[PDB]
Design a protein around this ligand. Structure first.
Ligand SMILES: *[C@@H]1O[C@H](CO)[C@@H](O)[C@H](O)[C@H]1NC(C)=O
Ligand SMILES: [Zn+2]
Length: 1014
């Protein structure tokens, strides 16, 4: 295995180093506004060395943005695809590329058989070519790598089945900045080439000057280069026709033949396109070839890519004709005039890349190597697209909940083959497709119109229900004696209980377990652990009595804690935010211990008085002017006091101190250690009163954030043996710090209310000597080093925080893990900050046509890990990556893939079993079974099950951490007949494995395996 820590890769372009050297000056470059006046030697091309030009027609189709997916399909996309089929069928030399399989599948299934056959023929013959082939063209900033792979697999599996093709070239022209997680996944999924567009204008200029717009993009830790994927970055401001023929949009716009008037479009540079005729074709070709030769100067081979398309183009039949006929007249003239030394034609993306590599192999060019990312994007001036790292945070959090429910539903149901009447495959396909759709660059990004966001939310809600149905049917089958199991596939044997989604204060959705001497003495609950190692985690349920005790199925008592159910209310009469306790529902909390990829059953039993193994938390309400807080049968009376500083410690864990406002002030790791200053603070950013306004995409603050005025907030302290917490009702945020014995969990119930033009940020202030360095993750896959640059504005120093961020010095590190993607930064040494929500009244001029005024309460979750790192083996100062410690990685897993909880619905579960998976291997902590998916329906004689295995890389800090078992996924199911390594989409077999054994993967590697069972 390659060492991902100690070997700094030698690359031609390392983006962090490039950023340190670049000046980012925004000067007027002439017609190419953000470049320079390109010059070329007319003698460069001649009869023995011609410029080969591929004009690639395309249509950017958004699966929801300003209209919903179905509205766009009915109004635009179905016509684009119907007319593409007709026009390509009738014009053999015309070509077209297509990216969004969600739309193509929706269209193809509705076609009659004659047209399905015509469509397959134009794909098989190379006229219509799929590019990337994912369900969508995903966002690359907020998306988790697992969901990027899910959507890629959904689209490519459909293409293989119905079109018999698997794209090896990717096209990503609209995500707002680009992540190296894409070439990582694509290169492990058979790809050979990829194309990107939205990168900072200063980066395009710098790379264009060095002819480094085509490069071999490798991961930041890859010393050898095995992850490298050839990448083409487009050079200009847009993918539209005015910014794709060459450097001068005033000229290129004249070659967009849809802009002459009858289509309702025009050229803003004021020179309209003119129909090509024999009297103007020579002057028109002279202008067009000059633009092409200038564009060609920015690249190394004699093969030039000229995209020809825009949003929802190639709809009308008249549009197909006007573009095709005019370009055909240009090609006929150009290709016949030897003096131009050009051969131009319509082509596809793969044709362009095949020609570029033919030139490379002939020795006509060598390409530079590159590592790093392309965040944060700016398309012009100081307009940095860091707002969408936070926009619509409720749905960003929903994305992560559904991510986990899809994984758990696919894994729980994979253990068995199911009859078609159970509708398992149907519900899982629905769930995968709705989550996949949301990965779109207007879905998770929070950049769609209000009614479109509602459509995505409704689709995800249906997906969550589908996952719950599959999970509970699976638990019932896995834990009931086989000869007793009698399923009704429409019945709810268990209901899921989720403590953090939608969350307390967001939706009262959890069911109370109702026990009583005159109704039901006890209830079975089951926990699932999707991770491949034994895991303990505290779990809580709502119960109708405080006198409840817990047992495992061997009837061994389990220690439990009961606490009240507290809900916070914004009291419009007293004008205070304070908690109310239930006098009939209580929370019972206990430690569940669950096998790797397994299940564990417990029983909750009521008694008339305090049970021996259940303790009760104390509760202290700190505020001036308190009023009573009765709690029914709860045995300890609530205590009151004036606001004051307090300290808490659960178990042998850290001791945390809080200010009188209920905010963390220090963390003491052990009895002997110092009280390290770690202070939480909430602040607000505003919007500029002159100039450009922040919107869904752009973050344009009116200066550094100002502190939120806190007043004298009400603080609630709950102290228990298993769990303690401090909660405070601040303006717009109920902030909670929860302690269970290790790093605290932070929960913020964020309700920005009607605070227009406000962004609320949560900041951590420490004295850690981080300087200008901080680390953020990319798609939940890797941590990349960031350097704050004071030569750039505040919003340029904001980066996506898809799952975590940290600062460190020689001795100390503070890591904040998140359960949802949000934007964040480190704006001064010792600080971390992450945005919670933003409410903007204005549109930001990118086409959305509205602000962001549809905020709703969201429960954000986090883990806060302070650690000593002086003993850890870390990368050298020049290495561009960082790595988590074991504790921080486990904390991230506790947020993203918690135990699932099931409550048996009926009164008695006949045939119940106590555990499933006790014999499953408990794998080393850095290894995960990211995906377990049965790939065959029950009618298949040979069953196939696919696994995606991912190994992260954790720092070595001196912990012996030992004894774990080798995990061979190919032997998890019995009767294995074959084990194969495959691409990550499971679509191509790469290796037949000896002994039917699936080897574990190396640090930072991901592999896929399929086991076959007789
Ligand atoms: C799929 O494509 C391969 C490669 O050209 C071809 O051999 C095979 O016959 C095709 N499958 C179908 C649809 O028959
Ligand atoms: Zn788009």
């Amino acid at each position: 295995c390659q060492d991902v820590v100690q070997d700094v890769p030698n690359v031609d372009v390392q983006m962090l180093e490039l950023y340190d050297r670049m000046s980012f000056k925004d000067i007027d470059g002439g017609v190419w506004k953000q470049g320079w006046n390109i010059k070329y030697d007319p003698l460069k091309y001649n009869a023995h060395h011609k410029l080969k030009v591929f004009v690639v027609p395309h249509s950017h189709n958004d699966p929801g943005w300003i209209q919903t997916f179905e509205e766009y399909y009915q109004h635009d996309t179905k016509h684009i695809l119907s007319n593409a089929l007709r026009h390509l069928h009738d014009n053999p030399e015309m070509k077209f590329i297509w990216a969004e399989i969600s739309y193509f599948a929706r269209f193809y299934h509705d076609l009659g058989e004659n047209k399905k056959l015509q469509m397959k023929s134009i794909v098989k013959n190379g006229q219509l070519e799929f590019v990337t082939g994912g369900w969508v063209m995903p966002d690359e900033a907020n998306s988790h790598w697992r969901n990027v792979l899910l959507q890629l697999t959904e689209g490519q599996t459909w293409l293989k089945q119905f079109m018999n093709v698997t794209p090896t070239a990717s096209w990503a022209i609209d995500p707002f900045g680009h992540s190296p997680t894409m070439p990582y996944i694509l290169q492990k999924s058979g790809f050979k080439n990829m194309l990107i567009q939205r990168t900072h204008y200063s980066v395009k200029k710098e790379l264009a000057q060095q002819r480094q717009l085509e490069f071999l993009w490798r991961q930041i830790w890859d010393n050898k280069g095995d992850t490298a994927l050839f990448t083409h970055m487009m050079p200009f401001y847009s993918y539209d026709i005015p910014h794709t023929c060459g450097p001068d949009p005033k000229v290129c716009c004249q070659f967009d033949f849809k802009r002459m008037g009858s289509f309702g479009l025009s050229c803003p540079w004021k020179v309209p396109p003119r129909t090509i005729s024999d009297q103007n074709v020579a002057a028109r070709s002279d202008l067009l070839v000059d633009q092409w030769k200038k564009k060609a100067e920015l690249y190394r081979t004699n093969v030039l890519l000229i995209p020809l398309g825009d949003d929802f183009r190639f709809k009308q039949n008249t549009e197909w004709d006007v573009q095709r006929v005019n370009y055909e007249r240009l090609f006929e003239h150009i290709n016949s005039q030897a003096h131009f030394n050009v051969q131009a034609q319509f082509g596809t993306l793969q044709e362009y890349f095949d020609a570029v590599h033919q030139a490379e192999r002939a020795g006509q060019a060598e390409f530079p190597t590159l590592s790093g990312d392309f965040f944060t994007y700016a398309d012009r001036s100081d307009n940095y697209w860091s707002g969408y790292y936070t926009s619509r945070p409720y749905h960003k959090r929903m994305d992560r909940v559904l991510m986990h429910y899809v994984r758990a539903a696919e894994m729980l149901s994979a253990w068995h083959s199911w009859d078609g009447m159970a509708r398992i495959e149907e519900r899982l396909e629905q769930a995968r497709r709705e989550l996949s759709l949301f990965q779109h660059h207007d879905g998770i990004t929070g950049t769609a119109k209000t009614h479109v966001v509602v459509d995505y939310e409704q689709r995800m809600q249906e997906a969550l229900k589908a996952c719950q149905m599959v999970m509970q049917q699976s638990v019932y089958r896995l834990l009931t004696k086989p000869s007793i199991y009698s399923p009704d596939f429409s019945f709810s044997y268990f209901t899921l209980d989720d403590s953090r989604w939608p969350g307390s204060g967001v939706e009262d959705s959890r069911t109370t377990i109702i026990l009583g001497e005159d109704i039901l003495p006890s209830k079975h609950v089951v926990m699932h652990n999707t991770l491949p190692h034994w895991r303990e985690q505290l779990v809580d349920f709502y119960v109708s009595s405080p006198f409840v005790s817990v047992t495992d199925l061997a009837n061994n008592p389990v220690e439990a804690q009961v606490s009240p159910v507290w809900s916070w209310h914004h009291d419009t009469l007293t004008k205070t935010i304070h908690p109310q306790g239930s006098t009939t529902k209580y929370r019972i909390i206990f430690k569940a211990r669950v096998p790797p990829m397994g299940l564990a059953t417990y029983v909750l039993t009521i008694s008339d008085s305090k049970p021996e193994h259940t303790s009760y938390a104390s509760n202290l309400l700190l505020r001036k002017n308190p009023t009573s807080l009765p709690l029914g049968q709860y045995p300890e009376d609530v205590k009151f006091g004036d606001p004051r500083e307090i300290s808490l410690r659960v178990g042998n864990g850290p001791t945390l101190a809080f200010s009188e406002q209920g905010l963390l002030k220090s963390i003491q790791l052990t009895q002997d250690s110092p009280h390290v200053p770690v202070h939480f603070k909430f602040l607000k950013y505003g919007v500029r009163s002159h100039g450009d306004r922040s919107g869904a995409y752009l973050f344009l603050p009116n200066g550094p954030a100002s502190p939120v005025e806190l007043g004298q907030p009400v603080v609630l302290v709950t102290k228990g043996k298993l769990e303690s917490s401090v909660s405070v009702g601040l303006p717009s945020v109920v902030h909670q710090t929860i302690m269970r014995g290790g790093a605290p969990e932070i929960r913020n119930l964020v309700d920005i209310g009607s605070l227009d033009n406000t962004e609320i940020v949560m900041r951590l202030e420490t004295h850690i000597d981080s300087g200008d360095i901080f680390y953020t993750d990319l798609n939940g896959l890797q941590f990349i080093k960031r350097r704050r640059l004071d030569k750039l504005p505040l919003q340029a120093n904001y980066y996506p925080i898809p799952s975590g961020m940290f600062i460190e010095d020689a001795n100390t590190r503070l890591t904040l893990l998140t359960g949802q993607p949000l934007g964040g930064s480190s704006l001064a040494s010792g600080e971390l900050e992450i945005m919670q929500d933003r409410r903007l009244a204005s549109d930001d001029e990118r086409g959305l046509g509205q602000g962001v005024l549809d905020n709703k309460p969201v429960l954000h979750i986090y883990r806060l890990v302070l650690e000593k790192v002086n003993n850890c083996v870390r990368p050298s100062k020049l290495h561009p990556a960082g790595y988590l410690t074991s504790a921080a990685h486990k904390a991230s897993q506790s947020l993203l893939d918690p135990l699932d909880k099931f409550i048996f619905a009926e009164n008695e579960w006949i045939g119940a079993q106590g555990q499933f998976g006790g014999d499953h291997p408990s794998a080393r902590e850095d290894l995960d079974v990211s995906v377990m998916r049965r790939l065959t329906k029950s009618s298949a004689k040979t069953q196939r099950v696919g696994y995606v295995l991912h190994r992260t890389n954790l720092m070595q800090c001196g912990t012996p951490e030992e004894h774990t078992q080798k995990l061979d996924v190919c032997h998890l199911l019995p009767n294995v007949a074959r084990c194969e390594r495959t691409t990550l989409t499971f679509l191509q077999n790469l290796e037949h494995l000896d002994g039917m054994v699936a080897p574990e993967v190396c640090p930072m590697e991901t592999a896929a395996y399929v086991s076959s069972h007789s």
